[PDB]
Structure formats: structure tokens, C-alpha cells
Scaffold this active site. Structure first.
Site, PDB file in Angstrom:
ATOM      1  N   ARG A 181       0.782  -1.234   0.000  1.00 55.08           N
ATOM      2  CA  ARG A 181       0.000   0.000   0.000  1.00 55.08           C
ATOM      3  C   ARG A 181       0.796   1.256   0.000  1.00 55.08           C
ATOM      4  NH1 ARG A 181      -2.754  -2.991   3.663  1.00 55.08           N
ATOM      5  NH2 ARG A 181      -2.775  -2.565   5.896  1.00 55.08           N
ATOM      6  N   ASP A 204      -0.671  -9.074   3.973  1.00 56.64           N
ATOM      7  CA  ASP A 204      -1.503  -8.143   3.272  1.00 56.64           C
ATOM      8  C   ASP A 204      -2.883  -8.661   3.189  1.00 56.64           C
ATOM      9  OD1 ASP A 204      -2.140  -6.010   1.506  1.00 56.64           O
ATOM     10  OD2 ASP A 204      -1.785  -7.296  -0.154  1.00 56.64           O
ATOM     11  N   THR A 205      -3.038  -9.913   2.815  1.00 62.87           N
ATOM     12  CA  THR A 205      -4.248 -10.670   2.983  1.00 62.87           C
ATOM     13  C   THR A 205      -4.437 -10.910   4.460  1.00 62.87           C
ATOM     14  OG1 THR A 205      -2.988 -12.722   2.669  1.00 62.87           O
ATOM     15  CG2 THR A 205      -4.187 -11.823   0.762  1.00 62.87           C
ATOM     16  N   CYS A 232      -5.154 -20.948  -2.482  1.00 60.84           N
ATOM     17  CA  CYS A 232      -4.076 -20.432  -1.645  1.00 60.84           C
ATOM     18  C   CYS A 232      -3.187 -21.537  -1.022  1.00 60.84           C
ATOM     19  CB  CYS A 232      -4.659 -19.579  -0.527  1.00 60.84           C
ATOM     20  SG  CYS A 232      -3.430 -18.796   0.497  1.00 60.84           S
ATOM     21  N   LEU A 233      -1.902 -21.560  -1.375  1.00 58.80           N
ATOM     22  CA  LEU A 233      -0.897 -22.356  -0.635  1.00 58.80           C
ATOM     23  C   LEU A 233      -0.838 -22.076   0.871  1.00 58.80           C
ATOM     24  CD1 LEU A 233       1.773 -21.930  -3.179  1.00 58.80           C
ATOM     25  CD2 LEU A 233       1.264 -24.262  -2.038  1.00 58.80           C
ATOM     26  N   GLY A 234      -1.222 -20.870   1.302  1.00 59.08           N
ATOM     27  CA  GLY A 234      -1.060 -20.489   2.681  1.00 59.08           C
ATOM     28  C   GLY A 234      -2.304 -20.801   3.452  1.00 59.08           C
TER      29      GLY A 234
HETATM   30  C1  HEM Z   1      -6.569 -14.491   5.262  1.00 54.43           C
HETATM   31  C2  HEM Z   1      -5.559 -15.142   4.655  1.00 54.43           C
HETATM   32  C3  HEM Z   1      -5.426 -15.451   3.121  1.00 54.43           C
HETATM   33  C4  HEM Z   1      -6.323 -15.352   2.124  1.00 54.43           C
HETATM   34  C5  HEM Z   1      -7.777 -14.849   2.231  1.00 54.43           C
HETATM   35  C6  HEM Z   1      -5.675 -15.742   0.875  1.00 54.43           C
HETATM   36  C7  HEM Z   1      -6.209 -15.772  -0.373  1.00 54.43           C
HETATM   37  C8  HEM Z   1      -5.605 -16.300  -1.498  1.00 54.43           C
HETATM   38  C9  HEM Z   1      -6.275 -16.635  -2.755  1.00 54.43           C
HETATM   39  C10 HEM Z   1      -7.777 -16.411  -3.038  1.00 54.43           C
HETATM   40  C11 HEM Z   1      -5.341 -17.100  -3.589  1.00 54.43           C
HETATM   41  C12 HEM Z   1      -5.443 -17.640  -5.029  1.00 54.43           C
HETATM   42  C13 HEM Z   1      -5.563 -16.568  -6.082  1.00 54.43           C
HETATM   43  C14 HEM Z   1      -5.947 -17.199  -7.416  1.00 54.43           C
HETATM   44  O1  HEM Z   1      -6.713 -18.202  -7.572  1.00 54.43           O
HETATM   45  O2  HEM Z   1      -5.416 -16.653  -8.384  1.00 54.43           O
HETATM   46  C15 HEM Z   1      -4.083 -17.077  -2.884  1.00 54.43           C
HETATM   47  C16 HEM Z   1      -2.921 -17.489  -3.436  1.00 54.43           C
HETATM   48  C17 HEM Z   1      -1.730 -17.572  -2.795  1.00 54.43           C
HETATM   49  N1  HEM Z   1      -1.516 -17.397  -1.436  1.00 54.43           N
HETATM   50 FE1  HEM Z   1      -2.951 -16.725  -0.182  1.00 54.43          FE
HETATM   51  N2  HEM Z   1      -4.379 -16.055   1.151  1.00 54.43           N
HETATM   52  C18 HEM Z   1      -4.187 -15.900   2.518  1.00 54.43           C
HETATM   53  C19 HEM Z   1      -3.036 -16.160   3.230  1.00 54.43           C
HETATM   54  C20 HEM Z   1      -1.840 -16.596   2.730  1.00 54.43           C
HETATM   55  C21 HEM Z   1      -0.642 -16.904   3.495  1.00 54.43           C
HETATM   56  C22 HEM Z   1      -0.461 -16.886   5.014  1.00 54.43           C
HETATM   57  C23 HEM Z   1       0.293 -17.249   2.630  1.00 54.43           C
HETATM   58  C24 HEM Z   1       1.707 -17.678   2.988  1.00 54.43           C
HETATM   59  C25 HEM Z   1       2.678 -16.860   2.612  1.00 54.43           C
HETATM   60  C26 HEM Z   1      -0.243 -17.175   1.298  1.00 54.43           C
HETATM   61  C27 HEM Z   1       0.408 -17.489   0.130  1.00 54.43           C
HETATM   62  C28 HEM Z   1      -0.183 -17.597  -1.112  1.00 54.43           C
HETATM   63  C29 HEM Z   1       0.542 -17.906  -2.320  1.00 54.43           C
HETATM   64  C30 HEM Z   1       2.056 -18.168  -2.405  1.00 54.43           C
HETATM   65  C31 HEM Z   1      -0.495 -17.879  -3.445  1.00 54.43           C
HETATM   66  C32 HEM Z   1      -0.317 -18.168  -4.931  1.00 54.43           C
HETATM   67  C33 HEM Z   1      -0.857 -19.590  -5.050  1.00 54.43           C
HETATM   68  C34 HEM Z   1      -1.023 -19.995  -6.485  1.00 54.43           C
HETATM   69  O3  HEM Z   1      -1.451 -19.145  -7.326  1.00 54.43           O
HETATM   70  O4  HEM Z   1      -0.738 -21.197  -6.775  1.00 54.43           O
HETATM   71  N3  HEM Z   1      -1.544 -16.778   1.386  1.00 54.43           N
HETATM   72  N4  HEM Z   1      -4.280 -16.624  -1.616  1.00 54.43           N
END
Ligand code: HEM
Ligand code: FES
Lengths: 106, 401
Positions: free
Chosen positions: B173, B238-239, B344-346
Site C-alpha cells: 500500500r 496483506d491478505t 491459496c498455498l497459505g
Molecule cells: C486471510 C488469509 C489469506 C487469504 C484470504 C488468501 C487468499 C488467497 C487466494 C484467493 C489465492 C489464489 C488466487 C488465485 O486463484 O489466483 C491465494 C494465493 C496464494 N496465497 Fe494466499 N491467502 C491468505 C493467506 C496466505 C498466506 C499466510 C500465505 C503464505 C505466505 C499465502 C500465500 C499464497 C501464495 C504463495 C499464493 C499463490 C498460489 C497460487 O497461485 O498457486 N496466502 N491466496
């Protein structure tokens, strides 16, 4: 209801699974790491591959088209009893199901 | 400002939603987005905002589109067209190679392994805050928590936090000093040396696991490793920050929902799943790889579609009274983590982060509210969020464990 997971190396684990929960979801929630469940269970990844025990095949609802497609992408030997276990949903009928876990998912 | 209506788009499908400036934003991000789900508004709309793009508005269509990367490609996931990482812009099959890798470091065995460090981290954050009667949650907790987890995962020194906090905010941001590409370049210049180090002298921290991993049949390149680690840092910061803030924002206004979780900690995991649906905050999308018909609508090659993750859960077909939070809800239906191969991996890590924050916060500071005289400012976008969350409580009502 009960599900037994046997590992490629012979390790046995048993869970008590609620009706309607996937064998993937149970396994991933409970320390059975040879099931990865990468995609969270929309049959989009092939990392929840198991071989259903031959005494249960004829009691598990059939693989749909999406599953069969994704079954082509498994990395361990594909067997006729191979299933993606995010698509196998716990019920009364499945009490005691044994699934074997292959030696790889990635 | 509205792009000219391309000729293949029917007029009655026109609904000019600005995903960066929706109309009723002071009513809350999710309500502002819920405008796509009035009974009069169709499944699939074309907005002329942001250069023109489709929006899916129902969970059923958001799922099919996510299940279908051959028609709906991740090559162009963001709106508008004008950011590496790896594996966000990749589809299967190449994408599985990088998923495999990321799972060695944020996978469920790692997450199960870290529960206790995570709780310990949550506890000292909260313990330093308890006596003060006040905090800015988003800055004082929602940001330091996930950043501190990343430092532990990548085995990075504690003194580096301020620096990454800065590089990170300029991306997530912009406080307006730095260009996004500049902020990205500077993140890369911190990672580069460490990744070189960890290659030549490997440890057992997240960066060494990634930097020495294999993709395809061969060792990852420094550059691939760099691009992945930046996603691991950015995607989880950020998420998480904005999501924890919406959560605490809600609980701050809702004494009874607070009471329930305080009197009954067992429900916290179900509570977290409900908060994920209600305060879903991500809306990215896909590019069409070919001309394709989809639920009565003809879509052209190169068209971009917004597939707002946040909406599926908010869709009254998927959940009765979608705008009501009810921790008891029979089937909590949502795609807050996305859907399909990119889910999401996370997701495992995100849940513990939330469950732990709730568990440790409520057993220490069960009573708190928004600071008097503040009204919370929201932003909308790819990751919707909360600008700041000033909270107050009486130190006398709090407790140490
Ligand atoms: C409230 C927590 C979170 C939410 C709501 C969230 C949401 C998402 C969503 C919706 C996607 C997929 C986007 C798509 O389909 O293009 C995504 C992808 C991803 N997230 Fe999260 N996320 C969260 C937390 C985290 C955390 C803790 C990590 C760990 C660092 C993380 C790492 C990733 C990564 C590396 C991707 C890319 C995955 C891919 O496209 O194969 N996320 N996240
Ligand atoms: S969990 Fe991805 S296919 Fe079963």
C-alpha cells in the site's frame, strides 16, 4: 465412522471421521502427511491419491469425469483401485474402509 | 473513467463496477461489493471501469471458471493489464512444480510443527499491548505477527523487520513515496544476497529449502527462487493483515459474538471459518485463452474476467442471510482462499494464524471496542482492506495467563 490409512512403508493410522467429510480432509487435518490435498479438494491437483482396498471399491460411489481426468495425472503407479480421496465422502457404509497411500503425491 | 463498450458486449449486461472505488464504501467493503448480487443484477456483467472486463457475480460461476484453466488462464490474473511471481501467472502443468516446492515450506506438516512458536509469537505481541489500554491493531498486531512468522520461517534476523515492513508497505500500500516496481526491485535486492548465501551454505530455513529445491528435473535458478520467496512474503502479508483487521473490527462491534467465543473457546475454529466467509477480501481473475461461450454469454479471446473470491460466500444461494455472521452456521460455504489449482498455498497457515490470534487475544483482552471518535477507513482492490484499527480497552478487565 472409521477409516484406516496404510502407508507405503506399512505404517497404520485410523481416524474417526464425521459423515460427509472427505478422506482427504480427515487425513490432512490429522497428521497423515503422505496425503497432501494441495488443491483443497475440487479434484484439481491429484495430490490426494490413494488405492482403495479391494473389499470396499464396490461400496464407494463411482469416480466422476473430472476425477478420472485428474487420475491420469497421478505420479505414483495408477492402479484400477486408484481414487482421489478428496472425492470419497464418509458415510455409514464406509465404516472401516482401508485405503493404501502410495509412496508419492508430488 | 469508462472504456468504450467493445462491440461484442451486449448493452443490457453493462454494470459499471469500479473494483477500486465502489459506490457505498463507507458502508463496508463487503456490502459495497454485495451490490453485484441484488436480485436485478445478472450472473455475468461487463464493467467499463478499469479498461473493461467481465465480472462473475455468483459462487457457482466463480467455481466453474476457477476449475477451468484451459479456457480461463492465469497468465493475466490482475485487472487492469498494466509483477513476476511465480506461480501466480502460471498454469498447470508448470505450476505443479512450484506448488510442490512451496509446500515443503508452508505445507501442513510445517504448519503443525509451528503451532507453538506461532502461539508464543501471538502471546508476546498481545502481552506487550495489554497494559497500554490501546493499540492500532493493524499496525501493532496484524502486521507484526505474519511478518514475525515469515522471519522465523526464512530464518531471517529480527533487526530486518523494519526494513521489510517498509518495502512491503510500498508494494502492498504505497504511502506514496516509491513506485511499485521500485519496491519490488528493492525487495529483490535484499533477497538476492541471502539466496546466494543459502545456496552456497544451505541451512534448514525456508529460503534454503526453496533455493536448493528442484523444479522440473533440475535445480531451481537463483532467479526462480527469488521470485517464489517474494510471493511467500508478499502473498501472506496483506491478505493476513487486512483479514485479521476486518475480523477484529467485527468483534469490536459485537459483544455477544465476543461473549460466545470467550465463554466457549471450542467454537473458535468454526468462528474463524465463518469470519473467512463474511470478510472474504480477495478479487483477482483470469484471461480468456480462446473465444468461448459461458452461461448465455459469448466471451472473446483476450477478454479479462474478474472472478471475485470474496463473493461466493456472500452469495445468498450459497449461504442463508449472507451478511449475518453466525458461528453455528450448518455449512460454511466460501472460496475465500480461491478455488481450483491455484487455491491459496497459505490456507493451512492462514487458519492457524487466525485461530491462534482469536484464542490468545480473547483470553487476555476479552473486552475492547473501536476508539471513540474514529470511523474506520476501508480500501477496495485486489486485496480489500482496512487502513487502521484503533482499539481501546480497560487494562483492569484484561488478564495475564
Ligand atoms: C486471510 C488469509 C489469506 C487469504 C484470504 C488468501 C487468499 C488467497 C487466494 C484467493 C489465492 C489464489 C488466487 C488465485 O486463484 O489466483 C491465494 C494465493 C496464494 N496465497 Fe494466499 N491467502 C491468505 C493467506 C496466505 C498466506 C499466510 C500465505 C503464505 C505466505 C499465502 C500465500 C499464497 C501464495 C504463495 C499464493 C499463490 C498460489 C497460487 O497461485 O498457486 N496466502 N491466496
Ligand atoms: S485434493 Fe486436489 S484433487 Fe484431491
Amino acid at each position: 465412522s472409521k477409516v484406516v490409512y496404510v502407508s507405503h512403508d506399512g505404517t497404520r493410522r485410523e481416524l474417526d471421521v464425521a459423515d460427509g467429510v472427505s478422506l482427504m480432509q480427515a487425513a490432512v487435518s490429522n497428521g497423515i502427511y503422505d496425503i497432501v490435498g494441495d488443491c483443497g479438494g475440487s479434484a484439481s491437483c491429484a495430490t490426494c491419491h490413494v488405492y482403495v482396498n479391494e473389499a470396499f471399491t464396490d461400496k464407494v460411489p463411482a469416480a466422476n469425469e473430472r476425477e478420472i481426468g485428474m487420475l491420469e495425472s497421478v505420479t505414483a503407479e495408477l492402479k484400477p483401485n486408484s481414487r482421489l480421496c478428496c472425492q470419497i465422502i464418509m458415510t455409514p457404509e464406509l465404516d472401516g474402509i482401508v485405503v493404501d497411500v502410495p509412496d508419492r503425491q508430488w | 473513467n469508462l472504456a468504450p463498450l467493445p462491440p461484442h458486449v451486449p448493452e443490457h449486461l453493462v454494470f459499471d463496477f469500479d473494483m477500486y472505488n465502489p459506490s457505498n464504501l463507507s458502508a463496508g467493503v463487503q456490502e459495497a461489493w454485495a451490490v453485484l448480487q441484488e436480485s436485478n443484477v445478472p450472473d455475468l456483467v461487463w464493467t467499463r471501469c478499469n479498461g473493461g472486463h467481465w465480472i462473475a457475480t455468483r459462487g457457482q460461476l466463480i467455481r466453474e471458471a476457477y476449475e477451468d484453466y484451459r479456457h480461463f488462464s492465469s497468465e493475466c490474473p490482475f485487472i487492469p493489464r498494466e509483477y513476476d511471481f511465480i506461480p501466480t501467472s502460471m498454469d498447470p502443468p508448470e505450476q505443479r512444480q512450484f506448488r510442490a516446492l512451496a509446500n515443503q515450506v508452508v505445507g501442513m506438516p510445517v504448519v503443525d510443527c509451528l503451532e507453538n512458536c506461532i502461539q508464543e509469537l501471538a502471546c508476546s505481541l498481545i502481552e506487550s499491548l495489554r497494559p497500554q489500554g490501546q493499540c492500532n491493531f493493524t499496525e501493532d498486531y496484524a502486521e507484526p505477527f505474519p511478518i514475525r512468522i515469515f522471519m522465523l520461517l526464512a530464518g531471517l534476523p529480527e533487526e530486518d523487520i523494519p526494513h521489510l515492513k517498509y518495502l512491503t508497505d510500498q508494494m502492498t500500500r504505497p504511502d506514496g513515496s516509491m513506485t511499485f516496481a521500485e519496491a519490488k526491485e528493492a525487495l529483490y535486492d535484499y533477497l538476492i544476497p541471502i539466496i546466494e548465501q543459502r545456496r552456497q551454505k544451505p541451512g534448514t530455513d525456508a529460503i534454503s529449502i526453496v533455493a536448493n529445491g528442484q523444479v522440473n528435473g533440475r535445480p531451481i535458478t537463483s532467479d526462480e527462487a527469488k521470485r517464489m520467496c517474494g510471493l511467500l512474503l508478499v502473498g501472506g502479508l496483506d491478505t493476513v493483515v487486512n483479514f485479521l483487521s476486518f475480523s477484529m473490527e467485527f468483534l469490536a462491534k459485537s459483544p455477544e459474538h465476543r461473549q460466545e467465543l470467550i465463554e466457549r473457546p471450542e467454537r473458535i475454529p468454526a468462528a474463524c471459518e465463518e469470519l473467512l466467509r463474511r470478510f472474504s477480501l480477495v478479487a483477482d481473475g483470469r484471461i480468456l485463452t480462446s473465444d468461448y461461450e459461458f452461461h448465455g454469454v459469448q466471451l472473446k479471446k483476450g477478454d479479462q474476467i474478474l472472478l471475485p473470491q470474496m463473493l461466493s460466500g456472500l452469495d445468498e444461494r450459497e449461504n442463508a442471510a449472507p451478511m449475518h455472521v453466525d458461528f453455528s452456521r450448518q455449512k460454511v460455504s466460501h472460496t475465500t482462499f480461491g478455488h481450483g489449482s491455484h487455491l491459496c498455498l497459505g490456507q493451512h497457515l492462514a487458519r492457524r494464524e487466525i485461530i491462534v490470534t482469536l484464542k490468545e487475544w480473547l483470553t487476555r483482552i476479552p473486552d475492547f471496542s473501536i476508539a471513540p471518535g474514529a470511523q474506520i477507513q476501508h480500501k477496495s482492490g485486489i486485496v480489500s482492506g482496512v487502513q487502521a484499527l484503533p482499539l481501546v480497552w480497560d487494562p483492569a478487565t484484561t488478564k495475564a495467563v
